[model samples]
Target: ANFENFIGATEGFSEIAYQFTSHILTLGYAVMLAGLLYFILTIKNVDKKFQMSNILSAVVMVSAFLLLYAQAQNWTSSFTFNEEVGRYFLDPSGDLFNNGYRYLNWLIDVPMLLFQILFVVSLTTSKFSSVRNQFWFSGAMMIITGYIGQFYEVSNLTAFLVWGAISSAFFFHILWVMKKVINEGKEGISPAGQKILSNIWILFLISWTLYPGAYLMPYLTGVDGFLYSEDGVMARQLVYTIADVSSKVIYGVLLGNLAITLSKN
Candidate 1:
């Protein structure tokens, strides 16, 4: 009687944790979707100028949608992997609902990868080319990459390389643009843009400093409450939640300021 009771008690708590994580992950998907939609709708005038910045915004919005959709599908599927296989190669339970959702989600990765490619292309060409040419080339590459990546299960290395390239390009371009804008005293940006950029820069610096703490906290504190636990759970959910909320607020402020600046231009 004692053995049986202990087993049930421990198992019950584990099950509760699993279910809780599932629910929390689902909520994350919802938040991501809401943020993505808000970003897209706010940039509806992107087609008007077809400028480099507008094109980048469009790519960012599209990526946000695909990323959220992928997350949603992953949550809905809840596929479990085998430790020995080290691949998502089996569906022993044959749970079609989860399996189907996972496959669909997998399908979107192709397009998402290509969209990233287009983003990189836009950033690279923005330096020397006309906005129209950059937009067209970027759109074409995005479409091509999306189709090809979907057709093939591209390696994680490829994804990492593409993302790295785009990020580097974007950061460099932003610094260049900001420097030129500030030095020339170009009336391109509005008062609101200035304010939002200032806020964003401050937030970015803070995040840069704190981001490393995410990795260090668990190891230093010896607390494996969530993510590092043997049974999967998001232990640092509060940390992530705060970070995400702050990020979205900053994005909203920045985009609003961008709109005001564009209108003035």
Candidate 2:
């Protein structure tokens, strides 16, 4: 049974719930804009060899900004206020606020984000293409599998679980490749640069993990009879906003700084 089909008049969200979500939704895009400005302004400061990373970051920031802008617009349009309950309800007549929009942005950003790392560190040309291919393949697989699984989020529990597990396989593969890159690249960088790369790797691990955590939130909250509730939605968006900024914006900025550090030497 699809929960979405049964959502009619069943989940009137409180004012706090709607307000919190819209606020964070706006903040998410705003942060992306800030990241974009930072990348554009600082692009010239990095070494010419490392400048590609900043350009890729700018791409991610712009793509993410547009995607989040759409999400914010969708959030407002997806609900209508009810006079009696003084709450917002899913508007059957309005567009569906599909979280799948995120997958589209991920499809564009993940490969570029993964590729940005190589620019800040030393890698042989042969090794570079090989690693780039690995990152691109595994990253795309992970995101695409997760995208498929998310479609089953409110409809088919078994499908969601299976596809999520499959997606996780690729996720682990990506992590393994990232670890290898960190270890191998550390050998060729300055001590300070090694520290920066290690720190950035840790940030990547934590931020990326939050995506799966948010992905599972629907199932986790559903067991408590609050699937897609106002609180659940708000929490999910909060996690997503945090993940996006840290993974894309902060990660990019730190990588840009690392480029400058290496360029100085």
Candidate 3:
């Protein structure tokens, strides 16, 4: 949304793509909230670590819902959804920061999500190598750089490319460090937990790789018409919605099931 470099044009759509995008995202977050609550309430006698995972899930879901809600509201602020062939056409000289809300959502959720995963792996000094500093550094860099990439107005796409490259590097680093920890057998989680965790990282790699691709939708659309919009804001929104659900809700659910399963056993 912040990619206002090509604004001042009121866009149009068929059957109102923006409506489905906004409503579907909100529904996804609502489902996440319910899933998180289920985990929190159903699991019992678990360590504080597992409980914290549930808590962070709730926090992330709450933020996701509200952030999307706010974005939807702001979206309607300039363009109402009552017509066809009209979507996120920013007002004349629409504030270039139209997409800052997603950045804001990432800022808070990224760090907490990192902590939640680390907690699941039991990455404490006594149990593992204690790379707490590494986690914090990587999380901060990834979120800040991602925010800068999408939220700022740059003269060229190179800046976003650079930011994306750096952020993705840190993203890989986080996963790599976790893999090393697990491979070295330093992870204090159970064999089953490790089984689930192994799949988690693989899934993480697969899901996160799509993020930069989505962020670069504008450039991508310039070449291939992946979706209808050449501008790629719609493409980005669609990809982001799926990515968010995959990363947050799907991941959270599987992780919680692991937590529950391990606790029961």
Candidate 4:
């Protein structure tokens, strides 16, 4: 939703506006690296059965770190300043800063995060493998459709809305499966661990919603004026970065803690 090709205006980001978006992306990757370190340090504290979850968390962190780092560099390299309009534009000789990177990152990270849920909860091997397949399928559907729709965000409104709504269906489907999984598995964990799992569910819900909200920014901000009439681009980036940190980094930390608690009991 926020790129030079989509915006297509005489005005671009002011110096501070550009840096704000860039800095948050920098912050996003930094947190990912930090979370990666935390996962590595604590992986052994969780039992052998649960260690896979931390390893998966570490993988999530590395993937996020690489993508966010590339995105930050992409943002900086893609733009050049124009003194007259007092904003930046895509550099004529440079590459496009595709938000596709974010979607691509989600394709890898989302399923992995959702998969982590299965690890934290107790499930039989057959059940775990079965639900794992469901999680991966539904998660891919959600992200891949959303990825397709994002391309249409600026060019074609009808296609954009259609794909986004379709993506939402899968999102809800995953949530339903997660609820079922949690309820089925809750009996195996201590009460405290159950409480934390429930909280993580809520956390997952809230953080994930921000993504669709960002995806729909064109419509959301369009109510006030045209998409480019305001600083919707910058705002979208800020929301996205915040969502990433909470959804991936914070979620991993919470899951790790729950794993440790389960190990103790």
Best by lDDT: 2
lDDT of 1 by residue, 1-265 (tens): 1111222223222444434545654565466556555655665644354233334444444554455455445433433444563322213353321223322432443233222222211233244234334434443443344333322212343553454344334334434443343333323445665565566555644542232233233233343344234232234333433343443334443544554454654
User: What is the per-residue lDDT of model 4 for residues 5-112, given as tens digits with 9 covering 90 to 100?
Assistant: 445344566787688878988998999999999999998788888888889999999999999899999889888888887777766688767887788899999888
Ranking by TM-score: 2, 4, 3, 1
Better of 1 and 4 by lDDT: 4
| Ten contiguous residues with the weakest lDDT in model 1 | 1-10
Better of 2 and 3 by TM-score: 2
lDDT of each structure?
A: 0.39, 0.83, 0.65, 0.82
**Residue 89's lDDT in candidate 3:** 46
User: Candidate 2 versus the native: TM-score?
Assistant: 0.93
User: Which pairs, if any, clash in model 4?
Assistant: none
Comparing 1 with 3 on TM-score, the higher-scoring candidate is: 3
- Model 3, 86-122: lDDT tens per residue? 4444454444326667768877777776667655555
Q: Tell me each candidate's RMSD, in Å, in order.
A: 10.7, 2.2, 3.7, 2.1
Error of 3 at 214 (Å): 1.1
Relative to the unseen true structure, what is the Cα RMSD of model 2?
2.2
Q: Highest TM-score among the candidates is held by which one? A: 2
Error of 4 at 142 (Å): 1.0
Off by over 4 Å in 4: 1-4, 124-126, 223-230
- Model 4, residue 117: distance off in Å is 2.1
